[PDB]
Design a protein around this motif. Structure first.
Motif, mmCIF file in Angstrom:
data_model
loop_
_atom_site.group_PDB
_atom_site.id
_atom_site.type_symbol
_atom_site.label_atom_id
_atom_site.label_comp_id
_atom_site.label_asym_id
_atom_site.label_seq_id
_atom_site.Cartn_x
_atom_site.Cartn_y
_atom_site.Cartn_z
ATOM 1 N N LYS A 54 0.780 -1.203 -0.149
ATOM 2 C CA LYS A 54 0.002 -0.071 0.033
ATOM 3 C C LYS A 54 0.790 1.269 -0.018
ATOM 4 O O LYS A 54 0.442 2.216 -0.746
ATOM 5 N N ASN A 83 12.549 4.879 -11.371
ATOM 6 C CA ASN A 83 11.352 4.633 -12.178
ATOM 7 C C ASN A 83 11.887 4.106 -13.580
ATOM 8 O O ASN A 83 11.017 3.705 -14.217
ATOM 9 N N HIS A 87 11.284 -3.345 -14.552
ATOM 10 C CA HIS A 87 9.939 -3.495 -13.698
ATOM 11 C C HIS A 87 9.697 -2.492 -12.793
ATOM 12 O O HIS A 87 10.548 -2.060 -12.095
ATOM 13 N N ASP A 88 8.404 -2.174 -12.441
ATOM 14 C CA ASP A 88 8.140 -1.031 -11.753
ATOM 15 C C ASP A 88 8.504 -1.370 -10.309
ATOM 16 O O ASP A 88 8.576 -2.486 -9.653
ATOM 17 N N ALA A 90 6.638 -0.999 -7.601
ATOM 18 C CA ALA A 90 5.474 -1.674 -7.042
ATOM 19 C C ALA A 90 5.620 -3.329 -7.615
ATOM 20 O O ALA A 90 5.164 -4.187 -6.572
ATOM 21 N N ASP A 91 6.022 -3.497 -8.601
ATOM 22 C CA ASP A 91 6.389 -4.995 -9.116
ATOM 23 C C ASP A 91 7.406 -5.520 -8.264
ATOM 24 O O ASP A 91 7.164 -6.870 -7.981
ATOM 25 N N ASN A 94 5.959 -6.454 -4.911
ATOM 26 C CA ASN A 94 4.939 -7.489 -5.048
ATOM 27 C C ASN A 94 5.841 -8.752 -5.428
ATOM 28 O O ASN A 94 5.460 -9.950 -4.730
ATOM 29 N N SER A 95 7.049 -8.888 -5.999
ATOM 30 C CA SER A 95 8.091 -10.033 -5.955
ATOM 31 C C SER A 95 8.588 -10.288 -4.679
ATOM 32 O O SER A 95 8.720 -11.446 -4.087
#
Lengths: 421, 105, 88
Positions: A54, A83, A87-88, A90-91, A94-95
């Motif tokens: 979040k 940036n 891969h962002d 956020a990605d 996620n990983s």
């Protein structure tokens, strides 16, 4: 000198800390999938991932030297290159968030050079500076053996099964509750294994029991001579109609029965016997309460009571608030761990390798999951500034205004006076 | 969602569009359905291979479409649907409901 | 979920639209989302009104626009103000 050693298990390269065979890496992966199947576990380890994914991240110079142009431009370059990854960010988060399921996640840093684009990893900022791209990524179930280093002190290296062995300083390790310096750390599922097993067992037993609840099924009692192949054709038709009755009879409005009956002169009992099968006992244990208790224990293990109980007025999800929930505090611990790992790892590598070689480094910071209670902050400011105490400065004027959701006011465009009282 | 790019803005045809600033634009698909994608093409060492076919067949390249990942964990194309962690309750709920209805009948 | 779509926006259509059309500028254009529902005005109203008279807040066009947009209006045009002859 290190006169001793933090030798954890060092059995055969694989870390044999966990004394239970099931929860060790060859089978711990399956065990974790099986426990992930469970609803309570899934939601409890999903809310934590939720909270981590979040917040956003923005590079910030240290406490002092925040006005230095060099530090500001370094922060700008760091953010832009963050940036600039294929891969962002956020990605990447996620990983990483496989973090909860296993307790560790490897991520091999794959650098990059702009070189005016036209390369393996294209960029957008033409400065010919080093950067990052691609993996991170990586899978926990691939790492076969962890390579130690003599006295077992500080050996964070493993393969990914010529070979595909990776060096110690090429990947980042995110451990959950590292206490004995074991690379796998300790996944939160470990201290929730037992209630899960109990719950799954009881639940399967309950489902099987419901399936085999044959109370009230129709039972037809026929004399043995009826059942057979040499039986008279009429008896065969009788058995066939009984089969149709058994397979088709329901409780519709013309439900009824016309059964033949004959009390045999001997034994004083009927021969044709139609009745509903009846049980003369009750189940010993109430499975529902047991399963609810185990689910409550499971949610207690991850301290995710808010999932069932709901949002209580004695707690909140704001770290900066004074009513931060326990689960939010655990998420805070996780975020601090991620921050420290990032700082000592890749940021340092980029700072050193790319040259420059400045003593003071730039760290990554994270905002709050949810804004604190606006009314309480307002009350505090009003009751403490009108008396003095807290001195009004630019810092409060931007902090409160970003608590609203804005950015520091632009004095270039103040509000009109005509358009007012 | 296989992107389709309308060309020079200007009534014209193909994928008609307002504006005539002769600039590129989007039209048509998106669209797409999940039951058509059969195979996902890899890339050598399986690293960073975002390409799939649509099996008659309409095999599309990597940069032609947008793919949205729900809970991408191991970087798998399919990601993880939220229905995944609700299979066990659903299967239990449905059967026990079905036993109830039969029981009443 | 909303942020995730914004993240796919990175490589996908806008970058394709931007790059193919040429330009090749370092800074790109990003897509944003609004809120699902308007925040509780009463807390917002209590906040500003009781914290500007003490200081802290510096009144700005952004403040006067977000507050007015919460009701559902648009940034006021200073060209036409509300009258005073009626205001008693």
């Amino acid at each position: 000198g290190e006169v001793g050693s933090l030798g954890l298990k060092v059995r055969s390269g694989r870390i044999y800390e966990e004394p239970r065979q099931a929860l060790r890496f060859p089978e711990s992966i399956k065990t974790f999938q099986l426990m992930m199947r469970d609803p309570s576990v899934a939601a409890s380890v999903n809310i934590i991932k939720m909270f981590v994914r979040k917040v956003n991240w923005r590079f910030v110079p240290p406490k002092g030297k925040e006005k230095d142009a060099k530090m500001i431009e370094r922060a700008n370059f760091f953010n832009s290159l963050m940036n600039d990854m294929e891969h962002d960010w956020a990605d990447f988060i996620n990983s990483v968030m496989s973090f909860c399921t296993y307790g560790f996640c490897v991520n091999e840093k794959v650098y990059k050079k702009r070189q005016g684009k036209k390369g393996k990893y294209p960029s957008k900022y033409n400065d010919g500076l080093i950067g990052w791209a691609k993996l991170p990524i990586r899978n926990q179930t691939t790492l076969d053996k962890w390579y130690f280093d003599s006295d077992y002190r500080k050996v964070i290296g493993v393969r990914q099964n010529l070979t595909r062995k990776l060096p110690r300083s090429k990947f980042l390790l995110f451990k959950y509750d590292d206490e004995y310096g074991n690379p796998e750390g300790r996944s939160p599922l470990l201290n929730a294994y037992v209630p899960w097993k109990y719950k799954v067992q009881i639940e399967e037993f309950e489902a099987v029991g419901v399936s085999r609840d044959l109370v009230g099924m129709p039972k037809i009692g026929l004399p043995p001579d009826y059942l057979g192949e040499d039986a008279e054709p009429e008896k065969k038709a009788f058995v066939k109609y009984c089969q149709e009755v058994v397979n088709d009879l329901i409780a519709n409005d013309r439900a009824g029965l016309i059964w033949p009956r004959f009390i045999d002169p001997e034994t004083k009992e009927d021969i044709f016997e139609f009745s509903l099968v009846s049980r003369q006992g009750a189940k010993a244990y109430d499975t529902g309460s047991i399963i609810d208790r185990y689910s409550k224990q499971i949610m207690m293990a991850f301290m995710s009571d808010v999932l069932a109980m709901g949002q209580s007025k004695y707690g909140s999800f704001s770290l900066a608030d004074s009513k931060t929930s326990l689960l939010a505090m655990s998420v805070d611990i996780l975020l601090k761990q991620i921050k420290n790992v990032i700082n000592r790892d890749l940021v340092a590598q980029t700072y050193a390798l790319n040259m420059w070689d400045d003593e003071e480094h730039v760290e990554i910071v994270y905002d709050d999951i949810e804004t604190p209670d606006i009314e309480s902050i307002g009350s505090y400011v009003q009751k403490t500034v009108a008396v003095g105490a807290m001195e009004v400065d630019k810092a409060l004027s931007d902090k409160l205004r970003e608590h609203i959701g804005l950015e520091p006011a632009d004095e270039s465009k103040p509000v009109s006076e005509n358009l007012s009282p």
